Design a protein around this ligand. Structure first.
Ligand SMILES: CCCCCCCCCCCCCCCCCC(=O)OC[C@H](CO[C@@H]1O[C@H](CO[C@H]2O[C@H](CO)[C@H](O)[C@H](O)[C@H]2O)[C@H](O)[C@H](O)[C@H]1O)OC(=O)CCCCCCCCCCCCCCCCC
Ligand code: CLA
Ligand code: CLA
Ligand code: CLA
Ligand code: CLA
Ligand code: CLA
Ligand code: CLA
Ligand SMILES: C=Cc1c(C)c2cc3nc(c4c5[nH]c(cc6nc(cc1[nH]2)C(C)=C6CC)c(C)c5C(=O)[C@@H]4C(=O)OC)[C@@H](CCC(=O)OC/C=C(\C)CCC[C@H](C)CCC[C@H](C)CCCC(C)C)[C@@H]3C
Ligand SMILES: CCCCCCCCCCCCCCCCCC(=O)OC[C@H](CO[C@@H]1O[C@H](CO)[C@H](O)[C@H](O)[C@H]1O)OC(=O)CCCCCCCCCCCCCCCCC
Ligand SMILES: CC1=C(/C=C/C(C)=C/C=C/C(C)=C/C=C/C=C(C)/C=C/C=C(C)/C=C/C2=C(C)CCCC2(C)C)C(C)(C)CCC1
Ligand code: OEX
Ligand SMILES: [Cl-]
Ligand SMILES: [Cl-]
Lengths: 99, 48, 48, 49, 48, 238, 449, 242, 187
């Protein structure tokens, strides 16, 4: 109470909340991957991608993540999906300056 | 100052200070109230 | 210090590469490497 | 939800995780790239929990 | 001139203006001039 | 702080002190300028230094003047190591030629009102025509970024997707100048120079210059702005 | 060997059972010193057994031969290896002294006297005998000052030490006229630890190094005679806690700060740790890459002052935020690097254009190229380069390995200092087990928290 | 029993069955990944092309519903968790079919655009020969690249739609229509009437399956809890302490 | 899955890293860790190999027909190189730019000739070997080195290029590239 401001007043509720936190976390993660199972993702923020499209200066960490993800997938497809036999050439692969 | 990222260094430095002071205070209150001060030892992992 | 680096570490008697999940992670690492800070690289090797 | 529901929703068991640490790492990076699993709200619920 | 504060439905902006607060921290003046150094008593200064 | 003792101090006592962004000043001689010997000359260590960065603004009530801005970057404003050839005649008609050197300076400034205008302060390929007192001309102005520069969604001139592929339908729209094409047309600028405090013993020259140049056009987008740059310059003849 | 009942300590508290055993305490200390010097000898002999002279010693994962080279033995002009005989002599002496100290440690750990107080009053001590243990502290301070003076005399009259900053590329030299100026010698101590300053990391020349060693040795001798001839003040008694575990925790805090500072030395310092022996730093590798590409495009016909990069700031030359002329690339963030192969290239405003265009040096360019090919960057499996690079170059820098391990040591010893510090405070408070169940301070104070 | 039936209905909606018509509930992602509508169209072309009346005409003989079915925007697994609402609010309402794009390079072989896999939100545009090796691509680098359309010379032609027999040679428009054909068939969409954002949405079948899978998992948790409740109705408030 | 014992206690079989290969009227050394790719580059390719890590480290051969007698009829090395500029790659960017520097106008790439050679075979046939640096405006992979070798068979003008990244050039690929280059023997 003097360090954090709040404290537990019950061993039973303390132990039950200790039980409660990981079961709730794992169940919500299960619901999230269930949502992912049908290609229903939290991939694109529509308004942010719109303002990034009509604003060449509007750089954000979210847009950096989005671009890194299509880079991930462009490098995934060829060597991770043999049954697609995607013979993507070197030039079509997106990459930055130097490196 | 905002353009070159000075508020970042300010916030990170003060957060370092505040976290170290917070866990040393956990040591202190465990000393004062009659405990074993390994609470600060346990917090040395989130500090780490 | 880097983690494990087992890229092309598995090869056969003919010397042909046995691509592993480590090599999958390697090419994934290339995918997230080529354009992290996609304008600040003026050299091939990233020693900064 | 990760070994049956995801492959049954997707094209097949090939997109299901394989039993192995580096294969789980491949599957994890697969959700990072294809699904943006870090930005998923239920995933943030789970990591917070 | 053609779109002053009373045309924009500004309520406490005329009351700030009437008693003396004319410059702003945004680098402009309501009379059409440029605030070289508005000081600490600007519109945003009074609000803060 | 002259050139004679500029080399007289080591790097330790000048590091982090801004002296490396300070041009030498001529303390001897006279400001009559005409005392300089005429003929063909080859200047070296021609130095540039700005004293004020102001951006033109179309004032709302019909006025038009340059307003003072705030430098967003740190002390990275000057340009050193300029070469070229000079000719001085008896009547005083002179020409200026610039060939190579640290001939660009990317610097972003903040306008009053939370506005940023990046620009490439350059004096490259300047041909100043006039007398010793004043002479002007035209110089080459690059845009800013390279052809391979990548925006938040790739794209750009040399390297890029040529379209925002995050939207499967925003490929054919009014954003022709945003994704299909990126403009890299190099502009032209105006420079006004004045020579003062000439040291005829060592061929040292100084004076105040003026630079007018359009800023960044952000690769086929909103029109660029004209920037007035004033400052001190220094040179050494042969 | 004691049990749990008679000592109150379990097996995982075994040497805690000898906290009140002066003789067995000193025996364990002597045995552990023997262990440390035995690893010194074993490391030296193993490293020289696997030492290949033609390849650089940092490419082979060698750490201790660089240390003896910094001491100034077996090397000549340019840092090349010439004779491993002093390396052998140092390792053999360490092994023999290890045998001696191990025999002493096992003697005083098995049949040594239990307590030294009843038999040897000079060696007899408790954790509360302030004058006696400050005399012991003064003895240790005089010993350490003597060691610093030994290093000073080695640099002065015993062949000198290696300077990487020497003209031509570093050589063994004799140091003369050390830095005795108080302001210059304490400016490092009163310095900021961030970049550009680096507190005491930024020591750059051997005259200053030896002057600082003379300063610390003379001051340590003065402190030793002070602790021997005086007594701790009552304010020090009031502010301090005076248990053996308290002195242990204080020493652990000192060595934790020591280890963090040494890790920073390993990752940044190239004067006390020449890159010719320890491998290049990250700063040295980044500026080496920039310099190598600059001279490559110079020799294939390109102007480095012009030809701005994709960012428009300058691919090969830019300006530091303070205004100094520095190399191109993201290596701008490492622009404060000082290694002895760029200062002749560096003029008043930074990099002199005419200097870098017309006065190159083959030793500088080959040194930069070799540091580029062996940057401090590799895997724990000793796979070179970044995590995306194929296993073809078997090299990870000793700088990287020492920085990593010394951070581990410093942080774990910080946690150990905090452990023993809390135990010291509570045990001196008389609380080393918990509340008394009848004298709880909580139930006797006011509510509402 | 009810989350048994929930798993049953989620499976039958995601895989398709007799009581799950495509006409009423939308297509399945497996039909797109198995080239069902595309195979139908192309063998409807092979018949009546192998007996005269070649690919210049008879594409108008192809029904417009079939080409609408051969579109990845028609895929139920192309939306997102939060691309909320109608599919028309996602891409616009289809107004007409422009015909199948036939791409030909400078020497004469017929190239084809690679179909977009369901797993990708974005996909590069490439042009592959009949033998299965990529002949061209949309150039990202455009520097020291020798696969670009601007140097290969690929023209696009359309048949049987609003655009029939029209061959475009301009690089910008052949790139744009190749990017459009990357998603499958070629269609025109009205967008300003519903303020279409641009991204694809999800089908009612997909949303049904997602909701019922989440509900089935929650009801599995509920059945475990109620099983505990049934067998342990005697020791809820506490234990026997003996 | 026929029955034979495992390979144990009999030393290693291959360590040099090169595996011989022969095609139509030619034979050379190929890297053992490289994998041939079905992406035919030019319309006249018979064999092509590439590295599995990076597709940049690739190599192929050309079997184009000839109208002259021999490469000597083609003349000097500069004149021979100046006709075959399609192998490096044309720039698909056409807009004029000066904001990249160090290159010619409306150019983002340059071909820096690093060397030429005149290598003779067993009896009288010359093996033209050159080295060309292929940089870009951004300098991707620090440029690219073009190691080209050409010869004349009974018709079927045979060219080679071992294209590889410049970071690989100083990070452990130059020796393998040279071993591929000097083994391009055509009989
Ligand atoms: C107040 C305390 C602040 C501590 C953190 C501030 C940042 C310290 C830092 O910038 O770190 C590094 C500095 C040194 O900085 C470096 O200093 C170097 C100085 O070397 C110079 O001189 C050298 C001589 O060979 C070389 O020539 C070199 O090239 C040349 O530049 C360089 O300038 C580098 O650019 C610069 O980064 O270390 C130092 O100052 C030594 C001080 C100890 C640092 C402790 C690091 C661990 C910190 C917190 C961990 C907490 C643990 C407990 C909780 C858990
Ligand atoms: C000393 C502190 C202080 C100062 C310097 C200011 C300053 C300012 N305030 Mg402010 N204010 C303050 C405290 C302060 N305030 C406090 C504590 C409150 C909370 C009650 C407010 C709430 C407040 C509001 C809601 C507003 C301001 C506003 C303003 C700005 C214009 C004032 C105005 O409207 O003019 C005129 C002021 C008056 C006409 C008040 C008249 C007083 C009457 C006539 C007194 C008569 C009765 C008296 C007892 C009789 C005396 C008898 C005689 C014989 C002695 C100005 C910059 C305005 C603004 O623009 O927003 C920024 C605005 O709307 N303030
Ligand atoms: C020279 C410093 C020093 C000294 C003299 C002591 C002395 C003592 N410690 Mg202590 N300790 C220290 C440092 C030190 N410690 C450090 C740095 C830590 C880390 C935070 C600890 C953590 C610690 C704990 C948790 C405890 C003690 C305890 C004790 C007492 C009994 C120890 C014992 O017999 O257990 C036996 C010793 C061992 C079984 C060795 C442990 C094995 C470790 C985990 C293996 C690590 C090796 C591995 C390769 C390290 C790699 C990491 C990195 C460096 C790369 C004793 C008086 C105990 C106590 O409180 O008693 C009162 C006890 O509870 N210590
Ligand atoms: C390097 C670390 C170190 C050191 C120097 C010591 C030292 C000591 N410990 Mg200790 N201990 C340690 C680690 C260490 N310990 C750890 C990690 C644990 C947790 C497992 C313990 C747990 C522990 C307990 C429970 C006890 C001790 C005790 C003791 C003391 C006497 C032991 C004895 O006489 O019985 C004899 C021991 C043996 C016969 C076994 C050792 C076999 C031989 C001697 C090995 C030495 C080989 C050596 C290389 C030979 C050198 C040759 C030489 C002639 C050149 C002694 C001073 C005892 C004590 O508290 O003292 C009263 C005791 O009760 N320790
Ligand atoms: C930390 C080191 C240290 C300390 C403080 C002590 C302290 C003590 N030892 Mg001892 N000892 C040590 C190390 C140490 N020893 C080692 C390494 C060995 C193995 C050779 C021995 C073997 C030993 C035996 C056999 C005996 C003692 C005995 C004793 C006790 C009294 C008699 C005496 O001092 O003998 C005299 C000491 C010497 C003759 C050694 C020479 C002393 C000079 C001053 C050494 C000069 C040091 C110089 C600076 C070099 C330092 C090198 C440095 C880099 C490490 C005493 C409390 C006696 C005992 O246990 O009581 C029954 C006993 O008989 N010790
Ligand atoms: C590592 C060796 C060592 C150790 C363990 C000690 C330990 C001790 N000394 Mg001592 N001392 C030493 C070396 C050492 N000294 C040396 C080498 C000298 C000669 C200069 C002295 C001179 C000295 C004097 C004159 C006195 C002590 C005193 C003390 C005792 C109390 C000190 C205190 O209160 O804490 C620490 C004290 C402070 C934190 C307040 C002082 C403020 C700082 C340290 C002054 C230094 C200035 C410098 C710019 C600080 C910046 C450093 C920082 C950036 C890291 C203590 C047991 C006192 C005592 O009780 O007498 C026995 C006392 O009067 N010492
Ligand atoms: C099992 C753990 C472990 C291991 C394997 C090592 C291993 C090593 N450490 Mg380390 N250390 C450790 C734990 C460990 N340490 C811990 C827990 C800490 C506290 C966090 C430290 C703190 C530390 C520091 C501060 C340093 C090392 C250093 C070193 C390296 C050289 C050792 C040395 O010479 O130090 C020192 C040896 C002595 C002090 C003994 C005295 C040596 C005398 C004075 C030499 C005199 C020679 C003389 C001039 C010759 C001339 C004679 C005559 C002609 C005059 C070495 C590879 C050094 C290093 O590499 O820097 C990073 C170093 O400076 N360590
Ligand atoms: C990856 C992390 C992880 C592992 C390995 C793990 C492991 C375990 N958890 C158990 C229990 C639990 N897990 C629980 C909560 C949690 N557990 C978590 C995370 C883990 N728990 C988390 C995050 C939570 C928070 C909600 C609870 C509440 C329990 C228990 O009641 C129980 C226990 O008592 O804990 C000690 C144990 C009983 C398993 C068993 O015998 O099943 C029997 C069935 C077996 C052995 C067959 C499984 C075979 C699998 C499914 C297929 C083959 C897989 C290979 C064997 C390995 C593949 C590995 C690669 C994929 C890398 C087992 C040791
Ligand atoms: C707070 C609770 C509501 C959160 C969601 C608000 C959505 C905002 C919104 O736009 O809604 C409004 C949206 C409509 O949204 C609008 O629709 C228009 C046409 O109808 C247009 O297309 C617009 O573009 C579109 O924005 O409709 C809804 O009501 C959303 C339906 C919510 C239920 C969907 C199925 C969920 C099934 C299972 C999920 C639970 C599973 C178990 C638990 C986990
Ligand atoms: C050798 C050398 C040198 C020199 C150096 C020096 C000179 C050092 C030093 C130093 C010093 C001289 C130090 C000191 C110190 C001290 C300390 C570090 C301490 C402490 C502690 C603390 C932290 C405290 C705490 C507290 C408080 C806070 C108050 C109350 C009480 C108490 C205790 C609680 C040089 C680099 C130059 C060069 C090279 C070499
Ligand atoms: O910031 Mn984020 O990523 Ca770590 O490396 Mn250097 O810096 Mn930048 O590059 Mn690579
Ligand atoms: Cl990034
Ligand atoms: Cl870089």
């Amino acid at each position: 109470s003097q360090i954090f401001g709040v404290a537990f007043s019950n061993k039973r509720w303390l132990h039950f909340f200790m039980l409660f936190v990981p079961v709730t976390g794992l169940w919500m993660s299960a619901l999230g991957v269930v949502g992912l199972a049908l290609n229903l993702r939290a991939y694109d923020f529509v308004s942010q991608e719109i303002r990034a499209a009509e604003d060449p200066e509007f750089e954000t960490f979210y847009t950096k993540n989005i671009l890194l993800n299509e880079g991930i997938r462009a490098w995934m497809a060829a060597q991770d999906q043999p049954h697609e036999k995607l013979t993507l050439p070197e030039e079509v692969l997106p990459r930055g300056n130097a490196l | 100052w905002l353009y070159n990222g000075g508020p970042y260094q300010l916030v990170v430095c003060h957060f370092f200070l505040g976290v170290c002071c917070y866990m040393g205070r956990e040591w202190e209150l465990s000393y004062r109230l009659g405990m074993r001060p390994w609470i600060a030892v346990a917090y040395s992992a989130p500090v780490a | 210090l880097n983690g494990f680096n087992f890229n092309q570490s598995v090869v056969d008697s003919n010397g042909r590469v046995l691509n592993t999940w480590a090599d999958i992670i390697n090419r994934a690492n290339l995918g997230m490497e080529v354009m992290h800070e996609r304008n600040a690289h003026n050299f091939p090797l990233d020693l900064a | 939800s990760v070994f049956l529901i995801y492959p049954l929703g997707q094209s097949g068991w090939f997109f299901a995780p394989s039993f192995g640490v580096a294969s789980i790492f491949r599957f994890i990076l697969f959700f990072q790239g294809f699904h943006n699993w870090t930005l998923n709200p239920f995933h943030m619920m789970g990591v917070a929990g | 001139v053609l779109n002053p504060m009373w045309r924009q439905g500004m309520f406490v902006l005329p009351f700030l203006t009437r008693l003396g607060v004319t410059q702003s921290w945004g680098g402009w003046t309501i009379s059409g001039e440029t605030s070289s150094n508005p000081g600490i008593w600007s519109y945003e200064g009074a609000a803060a | 702080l002259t050139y004679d003792e500029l080399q007289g101090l080591t790097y330790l006592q000048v590091k982090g002190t801004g002296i490396a962004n300070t041009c030498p000043v001529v303390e001897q001689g006279t400001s009559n300028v005409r005392e300089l010997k005429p003929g063909d000359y080859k200047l070296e260590k021609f130095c540039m230094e700005p004293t004020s960065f102001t951006v033109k603004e179309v004032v709302d009530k019909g006025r038009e003047e340059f307003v003072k801005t705030k430098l967003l970057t740190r002390l990275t404003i000057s340009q050193f190591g300029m070469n070229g050839s000079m000719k001085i005649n008896n009547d005083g008609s002179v020409e200026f030629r610039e060939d190579e050197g640290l001939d660009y300076a990317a610097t972003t400034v903040k306008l009053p009102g939370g506005e940023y205008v990046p620009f490439l302060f350059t004096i490259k390929e300047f041909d100043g025509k006039g007398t010793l007192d004043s002479f002007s001309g035209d110089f080459l102005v690059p845009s800013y970024r390279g052809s391979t520069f990548l925006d938040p969604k790739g794209r750009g001139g040399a390297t890029g997707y040529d379209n925002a592929i995050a939207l499967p339908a925003k490929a054919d729209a009014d954003e022709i100048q945003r994704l299909n094409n990126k403009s890299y047309t190099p502009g032209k600028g105006s420079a006004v120079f004045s020579v003062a405090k000439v040291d005829t013993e060592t061929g040292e020259i100084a004076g105040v210059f003026e630079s007018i140049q359009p800023s960044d056009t952000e690769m086929g987008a909103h029109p660029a702005k004209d920037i007035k740059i004033t400052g001190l310059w220094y040179g050494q003849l042969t | 060997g004691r049990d749990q009942e008679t000592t109150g300590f379990a097996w995982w508290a075994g040497n805690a059972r000898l906290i009140n055993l002066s003789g067995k305490l000193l025996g364990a200390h002597v045995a552990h010193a023997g262990l440390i010097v035995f690893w010194a000898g074993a490391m030296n002999l193993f490293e020289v057994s696997h030492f290949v002279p033609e390849k650089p010693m940092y490419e082979q994962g060698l750490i201790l031969l660089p240390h003896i080279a910094t001491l100034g033995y077996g090397v000549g002009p340019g840092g090349e290896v010439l004779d491993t005989f002093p390396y052998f002599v140092s390792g053999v002496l360490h092994l023999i002294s290890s045998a001696v100290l191990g025999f002493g440690g096992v003697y005083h750990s098995l049949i040594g006297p239990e307590t030294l107080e009843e038999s040897y009053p000079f060696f007899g001590y408790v954790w509360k005998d302030k004058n006696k243990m400050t005399n012991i502290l003064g003895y240790h301070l005089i010993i350490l000052g003597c060691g610093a003076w030994l290093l000073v005399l080695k640099a002065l009259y015993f062949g000198g030490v290696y300077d990487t900053w020497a003209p031509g590329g570093g050589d063994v030299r004799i140091i003369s006229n050390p830095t005795t100026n108080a302001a210059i010698i304490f400016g490092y101590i009163v310095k900021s630890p961030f970049g550009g300053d680096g507190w005491i990391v930024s020591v750059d020349n051997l005259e200053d190094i030896i002057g600082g060693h003379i300063w610390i040795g003379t001051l340590c001798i003065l402190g030793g005679i002070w602790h021997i001839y005086t007594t701790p003040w009552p304010w020090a008694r009031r502010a301090f806690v005076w248990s053996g575990e308290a002195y242990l925790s204080y020493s652990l805090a000192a060595v934790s700060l020591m280890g963090f500072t040494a890790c920073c030395f390993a990752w940044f310092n190239n004067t006390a740790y020449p890159s010719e022996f320890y491998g290049p730093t990250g700063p040295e590798a980044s500026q080496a890459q920039a310099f190598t590409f600059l001279v490559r495009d110079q020799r294939l016909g390109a102007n480095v002052a012009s030809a701005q990069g994709p960012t428009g700031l300058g691919k090969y030359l830019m300006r530091s935020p303070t205004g100094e002329i520095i190399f191109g690339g993201e290596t701008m963030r490492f622009w404060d690097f000082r290694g002895p192969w760029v200062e002749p290239l560096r003029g008043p405003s930074g990099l002199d254009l005419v200097k870098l265009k017309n006065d190159i040096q083959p030793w500088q360019e080959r040194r930069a190229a070799e540091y580029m090919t062996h940057a401090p960057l590799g895997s724990l499996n000793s796979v070179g380069g970044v995590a995306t690079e194929i296993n073809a170059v078997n090299f990870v820098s000793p700088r990287s390995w020492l920085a990593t391990s010394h951070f581990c040591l410093g942080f774990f010893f910080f946690v150990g200092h905090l452990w023993h510090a809390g135990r010291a405070r509570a045990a001196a408070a008389g609380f080393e087990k918990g509340i008394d169940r009848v004298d709880e301070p909580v139930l006797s104070m006011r509510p509402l928290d | 029993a009810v989350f048994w039936a929930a798993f049953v209905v989620a499976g039958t909606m995601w895989y398709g069955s007799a009581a799950t018509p495509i006409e009423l509930f939308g297509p399945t992602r497996y039909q797109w990944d198995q080239g069902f509508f595309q195979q139908e169209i192309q063998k409807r072309v092979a018949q009546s092309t192998s007996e005269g009346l070649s690919v210049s005409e008879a594409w108008a003989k192809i029904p417009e519903k079939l080409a609408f079915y051969d579109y990845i925007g028609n895929n139920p697994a192309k939306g997102g968790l939060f691309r909320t609402g109608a599919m028309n609010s996602g891409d616009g309402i289809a107004v007409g079919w422009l015909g199948h794009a036939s791409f030909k390079d400078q020497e004469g072989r017929e190239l084809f655009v690679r179909r977009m896999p369901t797993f990708f939100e974005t996909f590069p545009v490439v042009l592959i020969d009949k033998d299965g090796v990529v002949r061209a691509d949309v150039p990202f680098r455009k520097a020291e690249s020798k696969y670009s359309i601007e140097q290969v010379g690929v023209s696009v032609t359309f048949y049987g739609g609003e655009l029939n027999g029209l061959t475009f040679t301009d690089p910008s428009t052949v790139k744009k229509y190749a990017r459009k054909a990357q998603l499958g068939e070629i269609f025109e969409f009205d967008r300003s009437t519903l303020q279409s954002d641009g991204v694809f949405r999800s089908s009612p079948r997909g949303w049904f399956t997602f909701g019922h899978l989440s509900f089935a998992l929650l009801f599995f948790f509920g059945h475990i809890w109620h099983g505990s409740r049934t067998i342990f109705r005697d020791v809820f408030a506490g234990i026997d302490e003996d | 899955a026929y029955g034979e014992g495992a390979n144990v206690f009999g030393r290693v079989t291959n360590k040099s890293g090169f595996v011989p290969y022969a095609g139509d009227s030619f034979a050379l050394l190929l890297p053992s860790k490289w994998n041939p790719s079905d992406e035919k580059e030019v319309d006249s390719i018979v064999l092509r190999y590439a590295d599995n890590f990076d597709a940049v480290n690739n190599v192929y051969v050309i079997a184009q027909d000839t109208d002259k007698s021999s490469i000597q009829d083609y003349g000097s090395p500069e004149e021979f190189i100046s006709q075959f500029g399609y192998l490096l790659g044309r720039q698909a960017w056409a807009g004029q730019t000066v904001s990249e520097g160090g290159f010619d106008a409306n150019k983002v790439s340059s071909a820096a000739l690093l060397g030429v050679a005149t290598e003779k075979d067993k009896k009288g046939k010359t093996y033209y070997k050159f080295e060309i640096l292929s940089r870009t405006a951004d300098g991707n992979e620090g440029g690219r080195h073009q190691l080209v070798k050409a010869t004349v068979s009974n018709g079927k003008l045979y060219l080679l290029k071992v294209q590889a990244g410049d970071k690989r050039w100083f990070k452990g690929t130059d020796k393998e590239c040279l071993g591929v280059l000097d083994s391009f023997t055509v009989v």
